[PDB]
Design a protein around this nucleic acid. Structure first.
Length: 136
RNA sequence: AUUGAAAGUUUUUUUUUUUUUUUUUUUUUUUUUUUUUUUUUUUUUUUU
């Protein structure tokens, strides 16, 4: 039950890798302004020094969608982790979880372990922080 | 119409002076404005 409990960090895993673009890459820069010395009107997201960084949000979204596809392939039920559609809401256990938050923590942990999916318990869901952090 | 009477118990004198309801006493001790959201989809550098 250490997976959900964030009080104690009993392990720490870190992956540092290099991403090489086999195909051309275009991360949308907002298509609303071209502040730096870009090339086309639809500028990609870049640092003030011109460095075209990749947002951590994009990594998180890509990983979440790929995991959704993988779990759907493995016939494993999974939340959508977006909008008003997470299996906390789908299972109608949100009110009980909110009550348990003020109440004994063990009940909240049991609820979040039994009535919860994997993607929105790993990447995180509403009012719960995910276990994994994505950097830029 | 008394043995038979006609006299203010009155004048005069400030219950006044000395003395700060005063000294000491911090409306503070605790609480991360975080939390789930891919700037995405559509478009053949192209003809008489």
């Amino acid at each position: 039950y250490t997976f959900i409990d964030k009080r104690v960090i009993k392990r720490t895993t870190m992956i540092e890798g290099d991403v090489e673009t086999v195909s051309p890459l275009k991360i949308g820069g907002g298509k609303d302004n071209f502040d730096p010395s870009s090339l086309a009107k639809d500028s990609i997201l870049k640092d003030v020094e011109g460095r075209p960084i990749i947002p951590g949000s994009s990594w998180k979204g890509i990983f979440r969608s790929t995991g959704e596809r993988i779990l759907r392939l493995r016939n494993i039920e999974v939340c959508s982790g977006i909008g008003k559609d997470y299996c906390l809401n789908n299972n109608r256990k949100e009110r009980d979880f909110n009550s348990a938050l003020k109440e004994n923590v063990d009940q909240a942990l049991e609820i979040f372990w039994d009535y919860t999916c994997l993607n929105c318990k790993v990447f995180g869901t509403m009012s719960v922080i995910g276990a994994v952090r994505f950097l830029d």
